[PDB]
């Protein structure tokens, strides 16, 4: 479910144009950054939020890769 909440925080499943991450950062592309809920990400336990261009980065810690796998499945299912 947290994965569904993360998708909603970015704006929505259709607002996601790409999914990728590294060891402690999650990268999610968004069509409109004005629709990202920075406050929503914080409540989800995000340590911080960083936005670069149209790409959005959220710090979920080392478990960030877990969100990538869950979001990838939920967004593809």
């Amino acid at each position: 479910e947290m994965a569904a909440a993360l998708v909603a925080a970015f704006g929505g499943k259709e607002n996601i144009t790409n999914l990728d991450a590294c060891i402690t950062r999650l990268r999610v592309s968004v069509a409109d950054v004005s629709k990202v809920d920075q406050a929503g990400l914080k409540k989800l336990g995000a340590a911080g939020v960083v936005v670069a261009g149209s790409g959005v980065q959220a710090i979920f810690g080392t478990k960030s890769d877990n969100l990538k796998t869950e979001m990838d499945e939920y967004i593809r299912n």
Partner: peptide, 10 residues
């Protein structure tokens, strides 16, 4: 050159 590591979030 990485704020999550530099800020020791991890």
């Amino acid at each position: 050159p990485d704020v999550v590591f530099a800020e020791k979030i991890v």
